[PDB]
Curated annotation (Swiss-Prot), chain A:
GO terms for biological process: microcin B17 transport; microcin transport; peptide transport; protein transport; response to antibiotic. It comes from Escherichia coli (strain K12). The keyword Cell inner membrane applies. Keywords: Cell inner membrane, Cell membrane, Membrane, Peptide transport, Protein transport, Transmembrane, Transmembrane helix, Transport. The gene is sbmA. This is Peptide antibiotic transporter SbmA.
Swiss-Prot record, chain B:
One of its GO terms (cellular component) is plasma membrane. InterPro entries: ABC1_TM_sf, ABC_transporter_sub-D, SbmA_BacA. GO terms for molecular function: ATP binding; microcin transmembrane transporter activity; peptide transmembrane transporter activity; protein homodimerization activity; secondary active transmembrane transporter activity. The chain crosses the membrane at residues 11-31, 56-76, 87-107, 137-157, 205-225, 242-262, 331-351. It comes from Escherichia coli (strain K12). This is Peptide antibiotic transporter SbmA. It is found in: Cell inner membrane. Its main location: membrane. One of its GO terms (biological process) is protein transport. Belongs to the peptide uptake permease (PUP) (TC 9.A.18) family. It comes from the Bacteria. It is a multi-pass membrane protein. Uptake of antimicrobial peptides. Required for the transport of microcin B17 (MccB17), microcin 25 (Mcc25) and proline-rich antimicrobial peptides (such as Cathelicidin-3, Arasin 1 and Dro/Drosocin) into the cell. Disruption phenotype: Mutants are resistant to proline-rich antimicrobial peptides of eukaryotic origin.
Length: 393, 391
């Protein structure tokens, strides 16, 4: 952290505070006040040309200025060797993560005109020509090429950014290698842990903000869509139906799974301890003939087997909750629309757009849920590195 | 392999041959001939009760007999300690993998009546009551509970089966520990490689057959669905158009991605070599105070930088092909139906059922595509393990 980011204790606190001020200013008065000066209308095209429209160009300049002011302050307050990768590189990664989310919002907005065309064609034969379908797919493809080009370049930069984090960590560890030479497993920490720490931390760092950005991007979408869905199946009429139900289903559903699997991180940590003890005895017995004896390794593997069997038993309840939540989530989006579908207040495009919004939010959160094992790995790596640096003193 | 399974050279060859004979006999004459004796009609219910119907019960008995005959032969030909886990356990895992595929086929068949109801409701306000929608979701939920219960129990048994594989490997290595004691890194191989080898090999073993089973299960589905899709967009009329287009898009599309990423497994293996050389020097330098040699570790990490940078550049082309294929795959299912949608020869349920078939086949194959890195890990582990017992 200290080798890559400048003063991590204050840098991340300052970044969070500065981002909060920038977000608050833009979402309250900044967004409209800047647009009035430039003269940008709210008509955002559904096609791929919306990403270089006036409204999107303004946000590109606003993000650059906010990052530039943040970067210039930290370039003078405390210079760093990797300040161009830690500060500016993360801002690029955060921006591209937001951009790929807004591409999904553009794709989601395309599901309404397309499936309204499908409903028109199905409702009456020989009414919609095949040329209209070709153009609509052409609109989707235009957004797809933007998604393809940016995503391909995103993985290229993220991989290069991660390697610079490893390079920063490796340079710090190799500089004071003489004091770190005598630490047990020092070679693994310098080589295996530096790449693992950077890759793991960056992966869930992007995954966490991507899940948050998915909510932030689709909440205004659901507020506009909730006008066509005034009635809910069991809980009746609510001023904000879809927005409340989606938030409750997503956040509490994600929150409840964490509550069900509270014991899982503890069991995984214990599994790592018994495996390490089994490995540690084997390492000692590699040279000494009195170590790693049959009755010694028998009890150690029994502890490994017993704790692993405990993890499988507890993870069974997590599987029950996780899989049941996934199966219901496949039909929950349509379940909320049953009173509106019956009453004929929505079209097939609105039905598919609302269901897609739930699907995109579900997919963003699924990467977060499936990364709980990844989180346990990161804490294990960090503790090994923290102990490795503590010995350095 | 030899520690867990019976003789791997003949056991796997016999299993493949016996499965082929059982598959050929059942799919040609066995399926109908057994059904005629029992007297089971071909009408498979769409609800969750199809899994204990006469047609499915017959296949359960046929699979048990075929596995039992295979098991009894190998129980007498060459007894093994882990013969109830390697032989019978794998048969259970293969069967459950097939069962979860047939659950997806049952779910896919449910998309036709449900979305035909949705189209009816949308086409005429106040025509379909909300009670019909509640019942249809209840049908889906019944299938879901079977999927939930079996999947939860499948993961429980697979994890326990994998640990028995590690237990079999650990017992073999620890028995001859004195001979394997002097091998460098022996502690890592016995502890970490045994679980990694079992977990990795089993994961892709199920993933490979699941992709095959998904294609096999949905081919008869697409043959029946292709009757409602006589015209294709660019190639016009063609017999079995949906079946041919789906096979070409899926199999050749997956095959083309492997062709694009031919150099990727080679680059990953080289990346592991330069890491090993860098780690090997660091390990030696832990004790010796003269071979740390900051100039030496400078060149070793430079070789790490150059090879990783080469992997990132080549993987960019794979990303271009992979991501472009995924984006087109999202619309390819509907693209084939455009002449049918315009002519009004299909309904919304048929539209969604066909699109779901492509989605289920796509999702099954994506687990195989995303596991290409997992292939490289297994080969590295196997080579490390193979050199371990060579001694
Ligand atoms: C840390 C590493 C360094 C970070 C460098 C950057 C720091 C400052 C960044 C400020 C960027 C603020 C831009 C404005 C954001 C905004 O307005 O929100 C948009 C959404 O963007 C975001 O949500 C991005 C917010 C940035 C997130 C920053 C995360 C920082 C994490 C720090 C963790 C600290 C941990 C502390 C631990 C002690 C909404 O866009 P819209 O819907 O109005 O635009 C759409 C329209 O069609 C176009 O006009
Ligand atoms: C290896 C470990 C030990 C394996 C133990 C099992 C060996 C023998 C298994 C034989 C099972 C055959 C059952 C019949 C399969 C069949 O008919 O196909 C069904 C599909 O099932 C399969 O595809 C399963 C086939 C088994 C796959 C076995 C894979 C073995 C892999 C061996 C690799 C060898 C490598 C060699 C390397 C040298 C189709 O079902 P349906 O559509 O007719 O039924 C649906 C209907 O509604 C109900 O009636």
């Amino acid at each position: 952290f200290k080798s890559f980011f400048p003063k991590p204790g204050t840098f991340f606190l300052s970044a969070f505070v500065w981002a909060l001020i920038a977000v608050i200013f833009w979402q309250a008065g900044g967004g409209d006040w800047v647009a009035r000066i430039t003269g940008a209308s709210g008509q955002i095209p559904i096609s791929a040309a919306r990403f270089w429209s006036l409204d999107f160009l303004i946000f590109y300049a606003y993000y650059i200025v906010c990052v530039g002011l943040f970067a210039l302050f930290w370039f003078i307050y405390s210079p760093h060797r990797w300040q161009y990768w830690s500060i500016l590189g993360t801002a690029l990664i955060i921006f591209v993560t937001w951009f790929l989310v807004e591409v999904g919002v553009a794709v989601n907005a395309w599901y309404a005109p397309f499936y309204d065309l499908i409903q028109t064609a199905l409702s009456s034969p020989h009414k919609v020509t095949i040329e209209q379908f070709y153009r609509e797919v052409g609109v989707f493809l235009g957004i797809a090429l933007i998604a393809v080009v940016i995503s391909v370049l995103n993985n290229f930069f993220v991989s290069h950014y991660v390697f610079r984090w490893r390079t920063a960590m490796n340079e710090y560890y190799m500089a004071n290698w003489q004091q770190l030479r005598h630490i047990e497993g020092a070679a693994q920490r310098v080589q295996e842990d530096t790449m693992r720490f950077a890759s793991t931390l960056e992966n869930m760092g992007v995954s966490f903000i991507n899940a948050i950005m998915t909510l932030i991007a689709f909440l205004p979408v659901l507020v506009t869509l909730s006008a066509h869905v005034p009635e809910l199946p069991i809980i009746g009429h609510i001023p904000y139906g879809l927005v409340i139900a989606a938030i409750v289903w997503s956040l509490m559903g994600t929150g409840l799974l964490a509550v069900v699997g509270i014991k899982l991180p503890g069991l995984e940590f214990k599994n790592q301890r018994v495996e390490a003890a089994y490995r540690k005895e084997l390492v000692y017995g590699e040279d000494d003939a009195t170590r790693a004896t049959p009755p010694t390794v028998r009890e150690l593997f029994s502890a490994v087997r017993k704790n692993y069997f405990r993890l499988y038993f507890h993870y069974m309840y997590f599987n029950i909750a996780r899989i049941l939540y996934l199966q219901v989530d496949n039909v929950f989006g349509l379940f909320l629309l049953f009173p509106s579908i019956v009453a004929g207040t929505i079209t097939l495009g609105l039905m598919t757009q609302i269901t897609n919004v739930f699907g995109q939010v579900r997919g963003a959160f699924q990467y977060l849920i499936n990364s709980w094992t990844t989180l346990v790995e990161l804490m294990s790596i960090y503790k090994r590195l923290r102990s490795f640096e503590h010995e350095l003193d």
